Amino acid sequence: GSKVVKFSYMWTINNFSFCREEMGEVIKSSTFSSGKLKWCLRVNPKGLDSKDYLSLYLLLVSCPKEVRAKFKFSILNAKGEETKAMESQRAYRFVQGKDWGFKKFIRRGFLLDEANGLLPDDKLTLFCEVSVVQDSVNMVKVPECRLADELGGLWENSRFTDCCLCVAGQEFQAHKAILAARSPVFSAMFEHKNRVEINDVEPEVFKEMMCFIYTGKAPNLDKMADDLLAAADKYALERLKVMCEDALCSNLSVENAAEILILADLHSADQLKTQAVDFINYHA
Amino acid sequence: GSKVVKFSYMWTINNFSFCREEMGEVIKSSTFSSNDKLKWCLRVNPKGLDSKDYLSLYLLLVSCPKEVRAKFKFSILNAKGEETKAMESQRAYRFVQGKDWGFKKFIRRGFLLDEANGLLPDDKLTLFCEVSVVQDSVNISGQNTMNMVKVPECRLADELGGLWENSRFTDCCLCVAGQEFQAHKAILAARSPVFSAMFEHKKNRVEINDVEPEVFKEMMCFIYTGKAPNLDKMADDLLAAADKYALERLKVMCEDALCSNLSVENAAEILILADLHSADQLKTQAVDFINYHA
Amino acid sequence: EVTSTT
Amino acid sequence: EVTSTT
């Protein structure tokens, strides 16, 4: 017979109008699943190439080595009903990293005309429904990946450490291999006597940077975004740098924009600067 | 969310117009299923119940582990195997052990017994039932941003993978069947209670005599990245390896793959594997599969 | 019309 | 009309 799993995903993008994405550029949403597949949506604000449209796609992000699926995209209005729906006429074949969708989902001009009301408060709300079909001829619970947490313990308990990092007097124990694998700046030092001096980062900010290096996370980033941005920059931890940019971006206010702009120039935080420049003009 | 399970059943009743069942008498079919813990069967009253000139057809849930939501459709198959005189439930009905749902007046015997319609070739009545069991599922989704900043996806595993793959800053040697591999105590001890124990009780040389080099590489790759790209080709050996080195998640990831391959032809081989390496989830699946195909 | 014998 | 960028 058949097993058919149906699920939904809602995606709201604020200040859609101000999305400076140019033709070809993409915005990726968060992942979602039916509830062992992991999906997500990709949108091209100015077409994939016909740039007078929005390109919308459904991407299979992760899965255990193929999946058939029918999909339907639409836009929700203020009352929460669908409008402008496009649906696949059949189920398409997906594999990890594969996507399917509509190059010409909807015309910008139409989406931007306030007469149609698809952007209440300038917020675009995309809705996606998926239907996965499988032949009978999922039942095994597999634990989530715990790589980050186990490597995190390596730093939190100083197990099998091999080098010492002296931060403004304080001695911290770490693993060279891990630091080098994760930092080009650190990799450069260990490529040219197991004791490294650091005087550009404050201890507290250091512990958090290290937490990122060992686990890809930084739980306390919010209370030290500016200092972490600078620390991330000096040690070429590009992703962490961007995470701090996002934290600073959502703090922009008339009172702090100028300061945040200066900060972004000094640490070559391209996304933060643009956002700051834009924030300041809209308030000139 | 939602999960729908579809399955159907064909029931041929030989010498139909010959069966002596009188008004009120009911003949039931063999039980069938969609593994699934539910057992269903079909019920037909050749001469109705209350009425006399109609056939009464019902779907009956015979067994279940203490309720089910299901839509169903009944039809009759002609000589070419096509559906005819179909009748389906508008919605899903609630079923519990012993409960049935159907149609008191499915079809008139007059229409059925008119050779002109050819629904009784060789005086055989083939009824067809289509069932759709529906369950509610809760959708799961990640939090979305509210800033124009696009944050790259985490790349911890990939970078750490570069360590194993390009043998950088290694500090120990793993000797597998004569072949030597470079690794890192820290990482192996952080991810394997077993390696952790070894590097606990020079100590940079560890001999590995229970795994094949090809399988060991895949296992080591799972140790540095949490992924096993080739699990599809050695799920049975990788299971054993995962079990010997206490890499639970890899163990289950294999139980999962081995489970998706179960067939009447290998279920027995696999059960043996599940038993020896105590793969609980794979064991149940295998046992049930074996019983279901008994 | 859907009914149950019970 | 369904298509794939990949």
Swiss-Prot record, chain A:
Impact when changing residue 113 to N: In NSDVS1; gain-of-function, reduced BET proteins stability
Residues in MATH domain copies: 6-130
GO biological process, any: proteasome-mediated ubiquitin-dependent protein catabolic process
Pathway(s) this gene product operates in, as recorded in its UniProt entry: Protein modification; protein ubiquitination
Highest taxon above the source species: Eukaryota
Ranges of residues in domain BTB: 138-252
Location of region: Important for binding substrate proteins: 92-102
Effect of residue 92 to A: Strongly reduced affinity for substrate proteins
Effect listed in the UniProt record for changing residue 154 to D: Strongly reduced homodimerization. Reduces the activity of the cullin-RING-based BCR (BTB-CUL3-RBX1) E3 ubiquitin-protein ligase complex
Subcellular location: Nucleus; Nucleus speckle; Cytoplasm
Outcome of mutating residue 101 to V: In NSDVS2; dominant-negative, increased BET proteins stability
Cellular component terms per the entry's GO annotation: Cul3-RING ubiquitin ligase complex; cytoplasm; nuclear speck; nucleoplasm; nucleus
Segments for region (Required for nuclear localization): 43-152
Residue ranges, annotated region (Important for homodimerization): 147-178
UniProt KW keywords: Cytoplasm, Host-virus interaction, Intellectual disability, Nucleus, Ubl conjugation pathway
Subunit text: Interacts with GLI2 and GLI3. Homodimer and homooligomer. Heterodimer with SPOPL. Each dimer interacts with two CUL3 molecules. Part of cullin-RING-based BCR (BTB-CUL3-RBX1) E3 ubiquitin-protein ligase complexes that contain CUL3 and homodimeric SPOP, or the heterodimer formed by SPOP and SPOPL, plus a target protein, such as MACROH2A1, PDX1/IPF1, BMI1, BRMS1 and DAXX. Interacts with IRF1; this interaction mediates IRF1 proteasomal degradation. Interacts with HNF1A.
Recorded family membership: Belongs to the Tdpoz family.
Illness: Nabais Sa-de Vries syndrome 1: An autosomal dominant disorder characterized by global developmental delay, impaired intellectual development, speech delay, and variable behavioral abnormalities. Affected individuals show congenital microcephaly and dysmorphic facial features, including round face, small palpebral fissures, highly arched eyebrows, and short nose.
Protein name: Speckle-type POZ protein
Encoding gene (name): SPOP
UniProtKB/Swiss-Prot annotation, chain B:
Outcome recorded upon mutating residue 187 to K: Strongly reduced homodimerization. Reduces the activity of the cullin-RING-based BCR (BTB-CUL3-RBX1) E3 ubiquitin-protein ligase complex
Cell compartment(s), UniProt: Nucleus; Nucleus speckle; Cytoplasm
Domain BTB positions: 143-262
Ranges for region Important for binding substrate proteins: 93-103
Molecular function terms, GO-annotated: identical protein binding; molecular function inhibitor activity; ubiquitin protein ligase binding
Pathway, per record: Protein modification; protein ubiquitination
Gene Ontology cellular component list: Cul3-RING ubiquitin ligase complex; cytoplasm; nuclear speck; nucleoplasm; nucleus
Effect the entry attributes to changing residue 54 to C: In NSDVS2; dominant-negative, increased BET proteins stability
Primary location recorded for the protein, binned into one broad class: nucleus
Annotated stretches, region: Required for nuclear localization: 44-161
Linked pathology: Nabais Sa-de Vries syndrome 1: An autosomal dominant disorder characterized by global developmental delay, impaired intellectual development, speech delay, and variable behavioral abnormalities. Affected individuals show congenital microcephaly and dysmorphic facial features, including round face, small palpebral fissures, highly arched eyebrows, and short nose. Nabais Sa-de Vries syndrome 2: An autosomal dominant disorder characterized by global developmental delay apparent from birth, impaired intellectual development, speech delay, dysmorphic facial features, and additional anomalies including congenital heart defects, sleep disturbances, hypotonia, and variable endocrine abnormalities.
Domain notes: The BTB (POZ) domain mediates dimerization and interaction with CUL3. The MATH domain mediates interaction with protein-ubiquitin ligase substrates, such as MACROH2A1 and BMI1.
Listed name of the protein: Speckle-type POZ protein
Gene: SPOP
Residues of the full protein shown: 28 to 329 of 374
